[PDB]
Symmetry: none
Subunit: 222 residues, 8 copies
Amino acid sequence: SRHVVICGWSESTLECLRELRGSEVFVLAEDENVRKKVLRSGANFVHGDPTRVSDLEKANVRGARAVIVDLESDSETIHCILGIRKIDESVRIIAEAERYENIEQLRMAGADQVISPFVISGRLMSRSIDDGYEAMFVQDVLAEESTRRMVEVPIPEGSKLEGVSVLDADIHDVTGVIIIGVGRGDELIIDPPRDYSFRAGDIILGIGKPEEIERLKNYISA
Amino acid sequence: SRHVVICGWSESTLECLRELRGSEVFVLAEDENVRKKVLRSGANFVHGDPTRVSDLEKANVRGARAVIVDLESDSETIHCILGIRKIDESVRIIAEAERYENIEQLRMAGADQVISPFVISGRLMSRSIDDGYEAMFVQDVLAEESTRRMVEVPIPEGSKLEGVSVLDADIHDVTGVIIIGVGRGDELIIDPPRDYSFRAGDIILGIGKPEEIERLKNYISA
Amino acid sequence: SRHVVICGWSESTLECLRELRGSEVFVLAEDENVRKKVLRSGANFVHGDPTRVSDLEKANVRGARAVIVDLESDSETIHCILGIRKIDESVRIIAEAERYENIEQLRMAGADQVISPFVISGRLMSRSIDDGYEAMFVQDVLAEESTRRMVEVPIPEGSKLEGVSVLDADIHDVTGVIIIGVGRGDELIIDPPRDYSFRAGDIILGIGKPEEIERLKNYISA
Amino acid sequence: SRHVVICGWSESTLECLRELRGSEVFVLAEDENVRKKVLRSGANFVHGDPTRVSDLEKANVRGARAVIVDLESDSETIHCILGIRKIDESVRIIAEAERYENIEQLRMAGADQVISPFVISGRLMSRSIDDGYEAMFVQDVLAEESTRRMVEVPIPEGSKLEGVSVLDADIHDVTGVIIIGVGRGDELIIDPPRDYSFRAGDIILGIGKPEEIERLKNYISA
Amino acid sequence: SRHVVICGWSESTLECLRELRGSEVFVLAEDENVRKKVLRSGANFVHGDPTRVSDLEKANVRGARAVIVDLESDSETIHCILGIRKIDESVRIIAEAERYENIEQLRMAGADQVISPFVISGRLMSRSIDDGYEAMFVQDVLAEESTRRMVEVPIPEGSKLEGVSVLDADIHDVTGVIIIGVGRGDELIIDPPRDYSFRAGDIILGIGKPEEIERLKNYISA
Amino acid sequence: SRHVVICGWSESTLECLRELRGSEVFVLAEDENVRKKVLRSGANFVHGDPTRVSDLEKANVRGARAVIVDLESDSETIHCILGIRKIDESVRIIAEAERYENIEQLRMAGADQVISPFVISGRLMSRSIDDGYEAMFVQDVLAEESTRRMVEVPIPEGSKLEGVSVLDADIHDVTGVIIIGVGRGDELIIDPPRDYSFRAGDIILGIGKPEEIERLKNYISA
Amino acid sequence: SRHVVICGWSESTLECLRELRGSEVFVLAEDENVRKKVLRSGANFVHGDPTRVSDLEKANVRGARAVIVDLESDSETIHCILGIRKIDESVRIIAEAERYENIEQLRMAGADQVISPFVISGRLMSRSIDDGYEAMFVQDVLAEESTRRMVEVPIPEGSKLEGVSVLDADIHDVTGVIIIGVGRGDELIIDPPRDYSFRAGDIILGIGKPEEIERLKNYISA
Amino acid sequence: SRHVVICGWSESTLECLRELRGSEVFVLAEDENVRKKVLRSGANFVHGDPTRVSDLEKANVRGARAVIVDLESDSETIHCILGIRKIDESVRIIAEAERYENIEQLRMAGADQVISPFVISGRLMSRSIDDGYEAMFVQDVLAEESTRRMVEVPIPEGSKLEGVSVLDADIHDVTGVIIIGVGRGDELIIDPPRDYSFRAGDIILGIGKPEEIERLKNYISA
Ligand SMILES: [Ca+2]
Ligand SMILES: [Ca+2]
Ligand SMILES: [Ca+2]
Ligand SMILES: [Ca+2]
Ligand SMILES: [Ca+2]
Ligand SMILES: [Ca+2]
Ligand SMILES: [Ca+2]
Ligand SMILES: [Ca+2]
Ligand SMILES: [Ca+2]
Ligand SMILES: [Ca+2]
Ligand SMILES: [Ca+2]
Ligand SMILES: [Ca+2]
Ligand SMILES: [Ca+2]
Ligand SMILES: [Ca+2]
Ligand SMILES: [Ca+2]
Ligand SMILES: [Ca+2]
Ligand SMILES: [Ca+2]
Ligand SMILES: [Ca+2]
Ligand SMILES: [Ca+2]
Ligand SMILES: [Ca+2]
Ligand SMILES: [Ca+2]
Ligand SMILES: [Ca+2]
Ligand SMILES: [Ca+2]
Ligand SMILES: [Ca+2]
């Protein structure tokens, strides 16, 4: 599609940039000694301060399709998001919250998806005292190397599933995928109850083998 | 149960300490200026250096039921795990990996489970460009504020589900809990196929409402 | 009326505190060695961090009539403003902008008015090269020691001036105050034209002697 | 004309440098890491220590038409003003006070103008608790982007208004310019009373549209 | 006598406080970490900033008999001398000059005597290349451990030496004290010639043993 | 004569370097930004660390006639003095003691003349509370601009003054110079008693006009 | 021969680099400000992070004949040794321990030698309280400037001393070399008892004059 | 006998303190948070600065039998040694040199023996490239756990060995200790030649079993 802009350089945006090989990525960071490791990862580098609007317009934030913001603290991640909202009001911003209490401020400044790593990791430790199958499930469906891949299929308009119930559909019996949640717009419903009825435009978040996913796109098609 | 020792003090172990209320936690850290924040959360403080084998013995690593290791670097986390396996050879170690390439060296040193947050947050930011439900699923089932919970139920000895296959048991149709994976020992099989046979001592990893969980524990009992 | 919260301590808010003798003022700042200066100037002190919602609600932001934000940098002034807009979405926030390009990003954060002193003083030093009356005017009308004081008068309901234009009103000839501007809501018309007709509820900004103000309040009466 | 020497670099002298495009400006400061941004702003840089008289004579203080002094503290601004009066006893110094207390000492040292930003900011914060129209008047007439501009028109020798009082003058009706003060030398009379007569050589401080100001200059013509 | 105020804390004021035992000394400084070392030497501590007029007014500058000023820079010393002359117009000020070119400005700002240590040390280091007796003389007559002392004896009213010339009086031959200079008011005449006439109220600066000082004080009495 | 080496750069060595114009001075300092001010003062610059023996052997310490050592602290001054004494055991070193208690250590390390500026300044402050003629004498006889110059004349072998006593000589009656001290070798006797007898090779430290110094050089000659 | 890789830069690896003149040495360290002194020492510099396996493979660890690892702490030395054993499982690692406790962990990680300086220093301090001859023996046989040198002469296959005991050998009388130990593999027998017989392939650790050592090699000849 | 003072706290003196269990040790260091480590290891603590003569005499340097100096840098180790040589000119000072070029400048300061650990460890890492027996010998004979201990025996007065050469003595063939060196006073002859005749008072340095030492002390008897 279009290009992706990454403001700030940390260990989170490094691992993001491995799964973005084949897209056109511009990285915006203040330290000049990080120019080599960015250019090794297949991403163009732009030297500047990410909080400044004049250095943001270097990195093509206007036409971009997503802007991934991970600066050093949350004071600068909020200040960098509002600089982006001054340029383009409709671009999709994915922040990253260092502390827990700054998740609600980061949504008010304009971020469409706040991903806090230290709360996800902090809750996978205390759920792995007794038995650690929760921390093995989170770190195996996100990797693009395992056998079971967590995908998102949209329900087309003109589908055979418009208006049908879930128990009337029974998608795990026919396709082999596990419907862990159906989301509409900006909301996601984990474990949809039986009286939930599909609509065209909803997103079925599922887990399965890539053969079982190709059977699902035939089941929702016209 | 026995107590839980936390080596190091950062934002990951701060969120682990909020979920360890009620149990007994010792936090072992270098600074004298962190004593006020550990005592405010409900955990006794042990001033020391976690890389030393002598100061680990102050924090009662022997009688622990799990040790949670998160120091400033990856090199100090590898050293602190070797210090624990010098003391006790069967205690459980949960460690935090900063770089991706030190996951194989943190497990060889003796960590029973390695939780890498910057790989998790890196893979969620690359997946939330198009639509962010992969970041919303992982951040809601781990929080103790949602409706659906991700829990681990064991198969007791002499159950009704001894030897029974998955397509015959129908855990999702009878109980209504979503079965995302079945765990045995230290391996997890996400989306078990139709030929999978349940055994005694297995761990079922499931997502459902708390009322749905009560129907599962009554279903797999003896 | 109610109290006033001042977030952060600097030379801007120190001059704000002298003009607020008589009311009740809470000052919230991170240093503990600013305590003896604040209690000597007539205001209660609250030790805390102005960017944390836990220590903003200790200083009673909830029922305040205005909260005055002036922190060390513009990264934290945008953070402290969103911390107030999470607590109360209707309180009045007055912020001080250090630099010029952060004025639009401090209004998007939620500040009701942004006072940039280094843009005011930067433009008064440029206008004082030839003859210095621009800096003598601004620094005299705000000081409450001089004869001519710059006050605002609100137009009450059903006044004699309702619906009349300023050309037919002739405020300077019958009252003697100098109407430099008249504002409705959050806009202001400095030097309003002759085609401007007054309305009920407007705030008339004028400069004059205090004897001329009491002549005007009885002239704008209903 | 002649040049303008700026001693010290801060945020106030940066905004002063924007309005001095078209003049020749020598900036004299101690930081070497500010050489690029001064030369970006269209100003020749002269490295030195501004408190030292051997370095002030580098930057051509003698042939200056104004010296704008704003150093890091108030102690160095008094020392930099004492150094200038040793070189030229008649050059125009525009200072900047940090504290309120030093305005009487920065003017006894020799500065012909003291523009304190933290007192104009401190009195516009506490005048914006109720309704912020005083701050919207100060920050709108100083910018060279609004419609109304605060100008200074001098009275020529032999004018049509030589000797007449302001009440018989009727400046706001024939021209439209709001007359906020009349200045003679270094004394400004805000809201001149009706007994005040004009004199030859007076400087009129007015606010109006640019087409009204050209009506004002031709009305006071000889 | 009255007390002695010391503004600033460095090595010069430390040796001055070592030789001011018995009298009452207040030391006015910025740091809170100098209180133990001021209190260990026998001087009460007044925490403040000496550039402020109020914190100078705390330390009883009005009733002092001399104020000793040695701050971190020369600009702060000039500002502190201006503050003391703002408070009291007749107290004695002794100040330390760091650079040679600020002696004229420290005397013009109001110091009654300026003692420049780095000029003294530079001249003694330039004079001790060939043979170092100048440094030994200046460091030897000022210490309170030698045999010979450098003291000032006044000429009382109606003395035996009223009106008498130097070649007639023979202070070195009768008494045995070395007369290096005779001082009147604020001027010193080192090596007065043969035509010099003593007057009442003069100050004789002499070097000699204490018994020779007793003989001189008995010689110039009435 | 030969050349002079100055280790370190401070105000003391600068004021020393003003009085050494006409000699060949090498300055050794670690900061590279001081090359301009050294090259302005007529002294060649050598970049290096003055504590190192190789960077000392760069700066020609072997053939030098005096080495003037003023580094940042006293530890580095002692270390540089021992580094010099490793190279040449017989070169004359003039140190500079920052604190009082390091004078004996600087003498044991190898310095031939320790000049502490801060002790001289502290004693001249404490002796100038009442009347300030001692500071005027000390700062007036060292300058090479006043009328009375403190010189050192050697007694030649074959003089008319070999073996004569002071009271038999009476040098102030014949020449006009004031014998403030006669020194032999490394010792100096201030105010020589009457039974002191001259020897050939002694140094007469005197104060007087240069014509009186010429008359003294004729009086001690053969 | 092949090259030698030095990981980390400190004072120990600087003195090791002096005795490796004639070899090809690659230094791998993180500081860029050490590039000049490494290239002064005759060693190629390879910038990188030595704890990272992608940067150890830069410096050619695979084809090395020894790797000398000495990083800033003991935690990084264990991590750097674990990284090397992943690359080459048979290369010779010489480490350096900071604490005493980590010698058993630095050898279990894979180092074939651990040379702890702070334990050799700590036992030579407390053996030099009475008479310091043990410290004068350690620091004199290691330098390549004294007359006696500690050498290692191997026993050739088929020697004249194959199978004889040391008591019948009489090495100190025919050669003069003091035999302080005989080593087989990684075990050294200090002061071998008279029942110890020589074997083919043994390595003799001896001390002697260089003319005595050539007498020793020809005496153990085949 | 008497006590031992240790100036400064580091890992060298920590290993010195373990070997000095049983005697009385004072440790003098600037940090107060090293207090709990020192009292736990068996030594009294004295808070102070090791470079000041006031706080060296608090730790009883006067009557000590050896003072062990190891500070943070070589500038302060030379300063602390001269501070001891001002107090007692006959006490024994053992210093640790950080760098190599400061060994000669640490002996001129007055240290009786200088132990450079980074030269010992730097030369052991260079000799362990081919085969590592030089580092195994030095680290084994100093450790008091092994069989062969390196001790010194003094030759008493009137011994059987007085006047005999080492070729006629045959210490190794009779007693069985390995005479690596024999020192008179402050020199040492490692591998003494056959023309060396013994004298009364010499210190014989030998390596052997503890049973061989008691065989030697009865052989060197008188
Ligand atoms: Ca981050
Ligand atoms: Ca679990
Ligand atoms: Ca399946
Ligand atoms: Ca972490
Ligand atoms: Ca997605
Ligand atoms: Ca369900
Ligand atoms: Ca501010
Ligand atoms: Ca103007
Ligand atoms: Ca008026
Ligand atoms: Ca300023
Ligand atoms: Ca108002
Ligand atoms: Ca108008
Ligand atoms: Ca000073
Ligand atoms: Ca001289
Ligand atoms: Ca005398
Ligand atoms: Ca100095
Ligand atoms: Ca005096
Ligand atoms: Ca004379
Ligand atoms: Ca080291
Ligand atoms: Ca010994
Ligand atoms: Ca021999
Ligand atoms: Ca050390
Ligand atoms: Ca070898
Ligand atoms: Ca033996």
